[PDB]
Design an enzyme around this catalytic site. Sequence first.
Site, PDB file in Angstrom:
ATOM      1  N   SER A   1      15.767  24.808  90.847  1.00 40.52           N
ATOM      2  CA  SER A   1      16.352  23.644  90.123  1.00 40.52           C
ATOM      3  C   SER A   1      15.846  23.608  88.682  1.00 40.52           C
ATOM      4  O   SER A   1      16.627  23.528  87.759  1.00 40.52           O
ATOM      5  CB  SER A   1      15.948  22.353  90.827  1.00 40.52           C
TER       6      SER A   1
ATOM      7  N   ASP B   1      22.661  14.700  88.416  1.00 41.89           N
ATOM      8  CA  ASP B   1      22.477  14.008  89.728  1.00 41.89           C
ATOM      9  C   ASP B   1      22.282  12.505  89.503  1.00 41.89           C
ATOM     10  O   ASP B   1      23.058  11.698  89.980  1.00 41.89           O
ATOM     11  CB  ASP B   1      21.262  14.587  90.484  1.00 41.89           C
TER      12      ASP B   1
ATOM     13  N   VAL C   1      13.801  18.759  88.543  1.00 43.72           N
ATOM     14  CA  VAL C   1      14.304  19.560  89.699  1.00 43.72           C
ATOM     15  C   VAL C   1      14.853  18.632  90.782  1.00 43.72           C
ATOM     16  O   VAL C   1      14.198  17.699  91.205  1.00 43.72           O
ATOM     17  CB  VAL C   1      13.161  20.396  90.282  1.00 43.72           C
ATOM     18  N   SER C   2      16.048  18.893  91.233  1.00 43.69           N
ATOM     19  CA  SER C   2      16.651  18.043  92.297  1.00 43.69           C
ATOM     20  C   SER C   2      16.838  18.878  93.571  1.00 43.69           C
ATOM     21  O   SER C   2      16.839  18.349  94.666  1.00 43.69           O
ATOM     22  CB  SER C   2      18.007  17.523  91.822  1.00 43.69           C
ATOM     23  N   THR C   3      16.993  20.173  93.433  1.00 45.82           N
ATOM     24  CA  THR C   3      17.176  21.039  94.634  1.00 45.82           C
ATOM     25  C   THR C   3      15.914  21.876  94.863  1.00 45.82           C
ATOM     26  O   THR C   3      15.196  22.198  93.934  1.00 45.82           O
ATOM     27  CB  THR C   3      18.379  21.966  94.423  1.00 45.82           C
TER      28      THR C   3
END
Length: 105
Positions: free
Chosen positions: A15, A67, A9-11
């Site tokens: 995510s 990302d 998960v990046s957000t």
Amino acid sequence: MRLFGYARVSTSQQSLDIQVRALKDAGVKANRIFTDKASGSSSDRKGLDLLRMKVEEGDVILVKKLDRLGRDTADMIQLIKEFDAQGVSIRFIDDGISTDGEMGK
């Protein structure tokens, strides 16, 4: 041979759901989605620590990083070498594969 995928998960939003769908779109089984819930008390890089012990002989590890996999010492090369030695493959969304045997095949 199995369809394993790596995610993280990046957000803050959904995510993890954005990575799993990225692996399934790539060709990964939902049951084999080793993502990383980075949105926790601290960073969570266990999706590869567990994937390193879940990949089978000749398994394909699809990585649809949206990302950054890691850039410093070998964050994106450590597990890549641990899999290359386990006889496991690693498909990269960048072009399907990344270093599928770069010795002389």
